[PDB]
Amino acid sequence: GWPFCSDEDWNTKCPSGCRMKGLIDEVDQDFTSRINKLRDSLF
Amino acid sequence: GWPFCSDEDWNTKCPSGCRMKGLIDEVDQDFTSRINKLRDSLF
Amino acid sequence: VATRDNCCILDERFGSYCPTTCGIADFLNNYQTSVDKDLRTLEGILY
Amino acid sequence: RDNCCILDERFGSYCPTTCGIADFLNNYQTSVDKDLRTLEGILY
Amino acid sequence: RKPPDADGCLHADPDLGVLCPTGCKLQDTLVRQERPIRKSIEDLRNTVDS
Amino acid sequence: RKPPDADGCLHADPDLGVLCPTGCKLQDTLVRQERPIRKSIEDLRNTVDSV
């Protein structure tokens, strides 16, 4: 039950690296899947 | 249920900053307390 | 690589330096917003 | 004092990792603990 | 969906606990991932704009 | 005892979760704490011998 962050906490306090790797991978999967759908359509 | 880290993982995967701050706080409280007790035994 | 000249807080007893996860999150946000825009644009033309 | 180590403009200012923090903390804690123990041994 | 977590490992010492990728590892991943995505998209754009 | 955790805060964006001190904040903390602790020990050594 940590205190809620303030905008001033950013850069002094940062997210977990495991969380960031999860989000990075999710974005990569979304983009690769969307690129493949566009490729399938165009050619 | 993460896999156990290997010796090779160190420096590429690291502990939570919140955990390290907790450990740093604990060490400082220990040393501060011990220094005060040593001062009390001397004067 | 961090050096006395390009890193004012450098203390080598602490090992090699890296971006923070806030730097990572900010890069990811900029990259995701940018690429998603380009994609939506193509998806609107083709779909 | 938290924006003076920007080694790549795309990624912000750099810092040591928490592995570096943990290794430093281990050496510091054990070093100082031995020094305190020597004093505590003499006085207690 | 629950926010995703990836690539952690458990250290045997409970005080260290779960270890996560450093900013250096995350930066490497992002730089490498961005390359083909950006190039693929420029390629698609060039085809659509031709 | 259970492993201590300190100085986390919960971010407004549910995807970011709990934020923790960076390596720079942790290094600053340690650099500032070590100086007076080491100095106190040097002073105690002088006190013991003059004791």
UniProtKB/Swiss-Prot annotation, chain D:
Query: What is the documented function of this protein?
Result: Together with fibrinogen alpha (FGA) and fibrinogen beta (FGB), polymerizes to form an insoluble fibrin matrix. Has a major function in hemostasis as one of the primary components of blood clots. In addition, functions during the early stages of wound repair to stabilize the lesion and guide cell migration during re-epithelialization. Was originally thought to be essential for platelet aggregation, based on in vitro studies using anticoagulated blood. However, subsequent studies have shown that it is not absolutely required for thrombus formation in vivo.
Q: What is this protein called?
A: Fibrinogen gamma-B chain
What quaternary arrangement does the UniProt entry report? Heterohexamer; disulfide linked. Contains 2 sets of 3 non-identical chains (alpha, beta and gamma). The 2 heterotrimers are in head to head conformation with the N-termini in a small central domain.
**Posttranslational modification, per the record?**
Conversion of fibrinogen to fibrin is triggered by thrombin, which cleaves fibrinopeptides A and B from alpha and beta chains, and thus exposes the N-terminal polymerization sites responsible for the formation of the soft clot. The soft clot is converted into the hard clot by factor XIIIA which catalyzes the epsilon-(gamma-glutamyl)lysine cross-linking between gamma chains (stronger) and between alpha chains (weaker) of different monomers.
Q: Copy the domain comment.
A: A long coiled coil structure formed by 3 polypeptide chains connects the central nodule to the C-terminal domains (distal nodules). The long C-terminal ends of the alpha chains fold back, contributing a fourth strand to the coiled coil structure.
Give the highest taxon in the source lineage. Answer: Eukaryota
Q: Where in the cell is it found?
A: Secreted
Curated annotation (Swiss-Prot), chain E:
Subcellular location(s): the record lists: Secreted
Superkingdom field: Eukaryota
Q: How is it modified after translation?
A: Conversion of fibrinogen to fibrin is triggered by thrombin, which cleaves fibrinopeptides A and B from alpha and beta chains, and thus exposes the N-terminal polymerization sites responsible for the formation of the soft clot. The soft clot is converted into the hard clot by factor XIIIA which catalyzes the epsilon-(gamma-glutamyl)lysine cross-linking between gamma chains (stronger) and between alpha chains (weaker) of different monomers.
Q: In which tissues is it expressed?
A: Detected in blood plasma (at protein level).
Oligomeric state and interaction partners are given as: Heterohexamer; disulfide linked. Contains 2 sets of 3 non-identical chains (alpha, beta and gamma). The 2 heterotrimers are in head to head conformation with the N-termini in a small central domain.
Q: Return the domain comment text from this UniProt entry.
A: A long coiled coil structure formed by 3 polypeptide chains connects the central nodule to the C-terminal domains (distal nodules). The long C-terminal ends of the alpha chains fold back, contributing a fourth strand to the coiled coil structure.
Q: What is the purpose of this protein?
A: Cleaved by the protease thrombin to yield monomers which, together with fibrinogen alpha (FGA) and fibrinogen gamma (FGG), polymerize to form an insoluble fibrin matrix. Fibrin has a major function in hemostasis as one of the primary components of blood clots. In addition, functions during the early stages of wound repair to stabilize the lesion and guide cell migration during re-epithelialization. Was originally thought to be essential for platelet aggregation, based on in vitro studies using anticoagulated blood.
Protein name stated in the entry: Fibrinogen beta chain
Q: Tell me the classification of the organism that encodes this protein.
A: Eukaryota, Metazoa, Chordata, Craniata, Vertebrata
Q: Which gene encodes it?
A: FGB
Stretch of the intact protein here? 64 to 113 of 468
